[PDB]
Design a binder for this molecule. Structure first.
Ligand code: A1EGH
Ligand code: CL
Length: 391
């Protein structure tokens, strides 16, 4: 009969935040991006449609407050162009401008704009004052557009092609309302989740390809949101906050989460040979971190799936891949494959391994650095997922 008309918000797009100024031990300080009387227009693909939306902004890693002078949303028509008749002001407790203290995030008021799944919207932010923005999603695999003055409502962003970025600045979630029964699948992980080496602006990240499979099968109310961070590790900060410390924010607290796909750990193994020799971790320490995350998510009623760590022999031999890294990988994957605690294994390693040599990525799926898949590899990852377990 009639679907009960109680409406709810659902995460329809996400990006995990990193501190752009955070660096490895012994590394030189890194500068954050700044804006000064400038507009940045982000573009993002919605997983879930619905009748109204909310924008979550972030100063999580600011060292002092920032002020969003104006925030607007519109349907994107490609590049920096918007459908101007859909342009809406984003307000926060009724205000067009909002100040976020250092370390805080904020969900906007509801915006009355009906949106459809697998379509792109533009979220434009104007910063009138000098604004340090260390809170970013570094690897957007998506062009952002920066221009002078308040261009938040402009049809297109007027500036130089050098005034482009591929990051998201203080923009961490897009939530969309619906009365329909809805699943939200959070993909949690490192660059292989984030989509490094997938084609920029082409929505070829494996979660995008998974989303495509769901909608093709008719499941327009099963959403997939991306909580990958390129370079991320379970047990140590950089790149991005440690998987253990960000798991509550980036998985448990995602609006409407029902399912999680966890693929994380290869950087815990790879970083210790050279990038961070003081941060060696055992397979046991990685398994303990995974266990605690799994327990926390199951206690919330989330279905938890864990991916096996994909082969990476050939990845900067002796400086990322090592025999020690491989032994830890095998121990972790044996633990995953035999775990009775998780709701299911997604054997990404089996889907992507070289049939000629199981310790390497299949050459047809190799972006060329022996570690990150290409578009075909990310599509193959999505094809390896049983859609019935996301119900
Ligand atoms: C495969 C791959 O991606 O490896 C990446 C991973 C990072 O990008 C993090 C990704 O999350 C690190 C790798 O590039 C580091 C280099 O191997 C270091 C050597 O070049 C040092 C020697 O040259 C020194 C000679 O004295
Ligand atoms: Cl599988």
């Amino acid at each position: 009969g009639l679907v009960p008309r109680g409406s709810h918000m659902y995460a329809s797009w996400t990006a995990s935040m990193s501190d752009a100024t955070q660096v490895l031990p012994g590394a030189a300080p890194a500068a954050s991006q700044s804006f000064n009387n400038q507009t940045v227009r982000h573009v993002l693909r919605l997983s879930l449609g619905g009748n109204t939306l909310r924008v979550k902004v972030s100063n999580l890693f600011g060292k002092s407050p920032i002020t969003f002078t104006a925030v607007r949303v519109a349907k994107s028509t490609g590049q920096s162009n918007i459908d101007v008749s859909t342009d809406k002001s984003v307000t926060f407790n009724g205000q067009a401008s909002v100040t976020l203290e250092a370390g805080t995030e904020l969900v906007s008021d509801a915006v009355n704009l009906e949106v459809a799944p697998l379509t792109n919207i533009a979220v434009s932010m104007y910063f009138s004052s000098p604004t340090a923005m260390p809170t970013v999603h570094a690897l957007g695999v998506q062009t952002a557009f920066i221009g002078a003055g308040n261009q938040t409502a402009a049809t297109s962003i007027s500036a130089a092609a050098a005034d482009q970025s591929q990051s998201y600045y203080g923009l961490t979630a897009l939530e969309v309302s619906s009365i329909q029964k809805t699943n939200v699948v959070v993909t949690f992980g490192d660059a292989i989740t984030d989509g490094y080496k997938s084609t920029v602006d082409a929505s070829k990240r494996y979660p995008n390809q998974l989303d495509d499979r769901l909608k093709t099968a008719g499941f327009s109310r099963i959403g997939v949101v991306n909580q990958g961070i390129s370079g991320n590790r379970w047990l140590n900060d950089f790149s991005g906050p440690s998987g253990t410390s960000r798991f509550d924010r980036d998985v448990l607290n995602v609006t409407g989460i029902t399912h999680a796909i966890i693929l994380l750990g290869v950087n815990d193994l790879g970083f210790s040979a050279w990038l961070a020799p003081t941060q060696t971790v055992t397979a046991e320490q990685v398994i303990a971190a995974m266990t605690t995350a799994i327990v926390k998510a199951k206690a919330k009623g989330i279905k938890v799936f864990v991916g096996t760590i994909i082969p990476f022999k050939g990845a900067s031999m002796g400086y990322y891949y090592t025999d020690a890294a491989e032994a830890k990988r095998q121990t972790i994957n044996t633990f995953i494959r035999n775990s009775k605690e998780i709701d299911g294994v997604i054997d990404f390693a089996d889907a992507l391994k070289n049939p000629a040599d199981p310790l390497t990525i299949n050459p047809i799926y190799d972006s060329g650095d022996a570690l990150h898949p290409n578009d075909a590899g990310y599509e193959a990852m999505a094809a390896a997922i049983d859609l019935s377990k996301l119900q």
